[PDB]
Structure 1
Amino acid sequence: DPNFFKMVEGFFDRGASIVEDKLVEDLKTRETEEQKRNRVRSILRIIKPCNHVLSLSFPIRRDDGSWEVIEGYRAQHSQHRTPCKGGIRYSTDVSVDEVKALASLMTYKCAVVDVPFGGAKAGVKINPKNYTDNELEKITRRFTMELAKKGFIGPGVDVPAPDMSTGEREMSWIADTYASTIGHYDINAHACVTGKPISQGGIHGRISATGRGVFHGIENFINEASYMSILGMTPGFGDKTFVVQGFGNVGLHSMRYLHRFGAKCITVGESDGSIWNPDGIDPKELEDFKLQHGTILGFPKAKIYEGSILEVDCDILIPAASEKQLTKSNAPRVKAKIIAEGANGPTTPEADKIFLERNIMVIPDLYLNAGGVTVSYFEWLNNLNHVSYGRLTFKYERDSNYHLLMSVQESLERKFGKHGGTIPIVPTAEFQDRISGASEKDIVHSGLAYTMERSARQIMRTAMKYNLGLDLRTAAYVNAIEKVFRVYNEAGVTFT
């Protein structure tokens, strides 16, 4: 509907209009009260826009011998903290304005969850379905060169990741290209990209984790009646029904990772049609037809559903397909109590207005889609430390804990001894799984759940400081802006 870039920009102001006041008070100086206001406002006029944008065109030769051109983009929003990150989106609806927007979000999202990165986002006007695997690989390996050739790819400057219509392959084709032209002498060449296969430097839960970040976000608000008492809902996933808008990696892995804890799906909607079954749907069964058919229309254990998922009665609505999915023309027909934006700005500033009036909890992209980022932060480290986590200590930490329990056992016996004879001090079931120390699978699962809780705590803490009620979205930007700001300010806005 509107300029997707200005939409995001319209939000950002809402947050800044608010923090401005307190933000001036924090600022310590001898300036006039108004001059301080002109310091902060000036900085905020620097943060909002993107600093670097690159638009380029490719000659490529097809399989049939004919050439065509390709249009590709790559934006960097903020250099307050490097590297910069973002994904590569293959799509025909790519545009400079969508890229600049999404770049801005990655900058604020990363500040919500305290990961030391800036924001970027790429794009390619292309539809992969129309091209082979020998043409998509001849594009990607050429896209990578031109950027590296101009300083937009690198372990320490900019780091791409997966996004719509990409996967691990495309990341395996970027790595070999950088590492085999420039990275050869760089000891950190495989850190140029995340989302890689396991055999190329990846991480367990690379993709499942996004879905889990969603979950651990929901689980971190459902556990508080402080807000569900407003909604008129009771905590518990065994009591909830949800629907999904599209099957990305978010839609599936968010779906099944819910299904494990009693959350019932009732329908799902792809780009080609919805399908509904009030008795439930089995995501395991769903992957089955996707390998045998490609689409969900034709699934035997569900009824083809006529109408938009957005018009389905449910308890939680998961938009995961694409931004702009929910507008003011249909917001009044939410038919659902919570909305969880797993889709990079599906809603609108108006919808937000509707959903405050209707008392609808909307979970923002921020803090909700920040799972796939932290993980990619753990894959960037893994490849800078050149070692599996904990490998060095698995055997040492294992028995160090076994010599500890013997020091309890033997000191206790020492006093009572014969009183009860010998007192075996042995692990439990789960500690026996965790006695050798942390494995990557465990660091990941935990670090994620930790960050998410830590952050929501900071979010809900300011929403009450300012009494934003359900307007969580604004509650987030305030934290982001408040952090980013400190960096430019303390930094001496420029080095000129």
Structure 2
Amino acid sequence: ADREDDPNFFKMVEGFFDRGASIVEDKLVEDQKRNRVRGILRIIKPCNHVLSLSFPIRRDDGSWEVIEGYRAQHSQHRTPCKGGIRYSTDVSVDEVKALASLMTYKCAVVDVPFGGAKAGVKINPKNYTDNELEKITRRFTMELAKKGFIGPGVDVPAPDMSTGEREMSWIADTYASTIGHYDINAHACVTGKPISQGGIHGRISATGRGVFHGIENFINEASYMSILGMTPGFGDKTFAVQGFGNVGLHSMRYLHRFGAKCVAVGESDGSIWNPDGIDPKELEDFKLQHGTILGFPKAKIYEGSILEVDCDILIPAASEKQLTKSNAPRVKAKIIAEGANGPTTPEADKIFLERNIMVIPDLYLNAGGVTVSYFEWLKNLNHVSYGRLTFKYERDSNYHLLMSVQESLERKFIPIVPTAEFQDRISGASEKDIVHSGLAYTMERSARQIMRTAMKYNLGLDLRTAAYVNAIEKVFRVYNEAG
């Protein structure tokens, strides 16, 4: 099981909504009037629709099996709904409802126009062959489609840590072959697809790059950094990453690239530490040939997590409860960057606020994958890769501008050519560059929105409450201005 399977994490999300809703309530009436505000907040909170399914599957041995599955759509204030599919025996209706609500607020902070949704199929994928996993995926797709729980403009699912791009390809193929055969946008019913099936370039590192951009947007704000007693920028900064999966590896590689020194890396099986620094390329290559980071030559072994290691930035990059009331006073980092959902308990949040430790919340920091999901759905609607018709146009304009400067100067008094970096940007220009710019822009715009919300309500370093209040304000306005 994950932290996203934990019933205490569902209570946490509910409590974050209740806290945010009570803060916005007084300001919303100013902008019978209290009945409309409370009434709309009461509509927003619960999931509008939950579908429970029972569907047959014929195993490879010939025997039949009844599979249990569910999908919750928290909100339709923005259609389609959006949300992953988890294949786990630890899934439940309450999980699927809470994670759907989390997705409504996560989409709102990053201005992604989707209501929240979440699906779960109660099976352990390790007990099934690829053929049986395909059968489960295709039949689940059919049952969701017949009830309005999958469609390009209705509900667009996505993969999870338990599901991948092959399963998403099967969902799109089943939908486009049967129920959505007459839909020109049938392949937009699901995201996380392979490139050969309508997938988007820049999806693999989307979450990791979002964590880097989210951290970068606060680390380069001198107002927030002066409160933490630090200088702006990644130079002369130290960081530790707990959880060395794909998000942890990507975040490690991106901070290192900008001058930050990785002092410690934590894993499910032990942790490594080096105050002089740990190279991400050397550590990734070691893990790819030994299965673990234990025994890394340029680091010392430690039995336990790196949460209390002396660093500036702590990055919980694994979906598990890590920061609690017992270890929160022992944290030596000034910034806690949540690269996964729910790594800090509400009691630890309170301790961090008392200790002047800035926690960049998961609702914002873990929304990079959700942002590039939106771009993949848009790419399938557009039916063209990003930049396909404008890269050559932009290149010619750039050359014409440099030629204009050269001719003007030769007339006045001189080769004006692109730098080695600009020439490489022009030559290698592809879809991933537009997706990366779109993700960086989204993360930057949302960081400023969260900072302005925190200043409007005098929340200081309580960025989590600011992010929830920002999300609730946006969802409220859609309901209020629609009638």
- 1:268 partner SS: strand
Counterparts of 1:428 and 1:246 in 2: how far apart (Å)?
A: 39
What whole-Å deviation, never above 9, does each CA across 1:399-424 have from its counterpart, x for those lacking one?
A: 344445545555665566xxxxxx54
What whole-Å deviation, never above 9, does each CA across 1:375-419 have from its counterpart, x for those lacking one?
A: 111111111111122322344443344445545555665566xxx
After superposition, the Cα gap between the structure-2 partners of 1:233 and 1:127, relative to the gap in structure 1 and judged at 3 Å, is farther
Counterparts of 1:96 and 1:339 in 2: how far apart (Å)?
A: 31
Which shows bigger deviation, 93-102 or 232-241?
Answer: 232-241
CA shift at 1:154, angstroms? 1.0
What whole-Å deviation, never above 9, does each CA across 1:101-150 have from its counterpart, x for those lacking one?
A: 12112111111111111111122333333433333223222222221232
2:7 is equivalent to residue 10 of structure 1: no
Which shows bigger deviation, 80-89 or 234-243?
Answer: 234-243
Percent of aligned pairs with the same amino acid: 99
Aligned residue in 2 for 1:444:
435
Counterparts of 1:76 and 1:62 in 2: how far apart (Å)?
A: 30
After superposition, the Cα gap between the structure-2 partners of 1:360 and 1:282, relative to the gap in structure 1 and judged at 3 Å, is same
- 2:384 partner SS: coil
Note if contact 1:110-1:373 (Cα within 8 Å) is conserved in structure 2: yes
Counterparts of 1:265 and 1:437 in 2: how far apart (Å)?
A: 30
What whole-Å deviation, never above 9, does each CA across 1:406-462 have from its counterpart, x for those lacking one?
A: 45555665566xxxxxx5444444444556896322211211111211121121122
CA shift at 1:263, angstroms? 2.2
Note if contact 1:213-1:372 (Cα within 8 Å) is conserved in structure 2: yes
Which shows bigger deviation, 387-396 or 8-17?
Answer: 387-396
- 2:307 partner SS: helix
Counterparts of 1:93 and 1:169 in 2: how far apart (Å)?
A: 22
What whole-Å deviation, never above 9, does each CA across 1:146-174 have from its counterpart, x for those lacking one?
A: 21232211111111112222222222222
What whole-Å deviation, never above 9, does each CA across 1:57-94 have from its counterpart, x for those lacking one?
A: 34334344444443322111110011111112233322
Counterparts of 1:469 and 1:323 in 2: how far apart (Å)?
A: 26
Counterparts of 1:334 and 1:66 in 2: how far apart (Å)?
A: 53
How many residues were matched structurally? 478
- 2:364 partner SS: coil
CA shift at 1:371, angstroms? 1.0
Match of 1:76 among 73, 79, 82: 73
After superposition, the Cα gap between the structure-2 partners of 1:166 and 1:411, relative to the gap in structure 1 and judged at 3 Å, is same
Q: TM-score, normalised by structure 2?
A: 0.91
Note if contact 1:398-1:437 (Cα within 8 Å) is conserved in structure 2: no
After superposition, the Cα gap between the structure-2 partners of 1:358 and 1:92, relative to the gap in structure 1 and judged at 3 Å, is farther
Aligned residue in 2 for 1:39:
36
- 2:69 partner SS: strand
Note if contact 1:394-1:436 (Cα within 8 Å) is conserved in structure 2: no
CA shift at 1:317, angstroms? 1.7
After superposition, the Cα gap between the structure-2 partners of 1:2 and 1:55, relative to the gap in structure 1 and judged at 3 Å, is closer
Note if contact 1:102-1:344 (Cα within 8 Å) is conserved in structure 2: no
CA shift at 1:303, angstroms? 3.7
- 2:118 partner SS: strand
Which shows bigger deviation, 227-236 or 143-152?
Answer: 227-236
Which shows bigger deviation, 272-281 or 473-482?
Answer: 272-281
Counterparts of 2:221 and 2:345 in 1: how far apart (Å)?
A: 26
Note if contact 1:53-1:73 (Cα within 8 Å) is conserved in structure 2: yes
Note if contact 2:379-2:385 (Cα within 8 Å) is conserved in structure 1: yes
What whole-Å deviation, never above 9, does each CA across 1:320-378 have from its counterpart, x for those lacking one?
A: 22143322233233232221112112222222111111221111012211111221111
Counterparts of 2:112 and 2:359 in 1: how far apart (Å)?
A: 24
Structure 2 unmatched ranges of 5 or more: 1-5
Counterparts of 2:72 and 2:64 in 1: how far apart (Å)?
A: 26
After superposition, the Cα gap between the structure-2 partners of 1:162 and 1:290, relative to the gap in structure 1 and judged at 3 Å, is farther
After superposition, the Cα gap between the structure-2 partners of 1:309 and 1:63, relative to the gap in structure 1 and judged at 3 Å, is farther
Note if contact 2:247-2:317 (Cα within 8 Å) is conserved in structure 1: yes
After superposition, the Cα gap between the structure-2 partners of 1:339 and 1:92, relative to the gap in structure 1 and judged at 3 Å, is farther
